[PDB]
Amino acid sequence: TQREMETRYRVVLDVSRDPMVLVSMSTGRIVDLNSAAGLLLGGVRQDLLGAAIAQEFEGRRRGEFMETMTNLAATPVEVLARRSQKRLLVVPRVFRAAGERLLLCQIDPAD
Amino acid sequence: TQREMETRYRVVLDVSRDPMVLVSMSTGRIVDLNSAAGLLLGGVRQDLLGAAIAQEFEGRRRGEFMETMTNLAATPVEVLARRSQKRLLVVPRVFRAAGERLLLCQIDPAD
Structure with missing residues (x-):
C-alpha cells in the first residue's frame, strides 16, 4: 500500500x-515533474530532475526566487525559460509531506 | 514515507x-477524482466517490462499459453525463497498483 x-x-x-513541477523547499531543486512541464521548460526529465529551479529562469537566483514563490503561495510569477525561450507564468502552492515542504508549481504559457 | x-x-x-476519474477495475466504481472531473460530470465529490461509473452515463451499463474501456485502454468513448447533461469524451488508461487494476480516465468536453 x-x-x-x-x-x-x-x-x-x-x-x-x-x-506541474515539484520543488524541494529545502534546496530549491526540482524533485519531480511531468512531460507537459518539461515541454514548456524546454528540457528532458533527465536534465531537469535535481536542477535548481531558479536557474531555469533567466535573471532569477535561488534566494530571491524561492522567497518570491513562498510569499505568493501564502496568499503568478512571470518568467522566461532558458532552454525553451518561452515566456511562462508560474503559480506556486506549498504543502507539507513527511516533515518537509514542497512547492507544487503550475506552469502556463504567458504569450 | x-x-x-x-x-x-x-x-x-x-x-x-x-x-481525471479513478475507477476500480474490480467493481467499476469511482475510487477518486478531482474537482475538474466533478464539474464535467455535474456532481460533488461526496456523491461520486463509490458510484458506479457506467451509471453516470446515460444508456451505459457496467458490464458493457467496463469491457469497452478495458478494450480501448489496450490500444475516446463518447458519453453523456446524467447530472451535468454534458456530452463528454473519455480516454481510459489501465495500471497495476498493489495486485489490483485501476482505470485512470481523462474527461474532456465533447461539444
Missing part, C-alpha cells in the same frame, strides 16, 4: 496534461 | 486542472 500510493502518484502526475 | 506518497498523490490529483 506504500507501493500503491507511489504508483497512484506517478500515474496521476505523468498522465495529467496540466504542466 | 507512506504518508508522503499519499500526500503527494492527493495534492497532484486535486491541483491538476486535467479532469
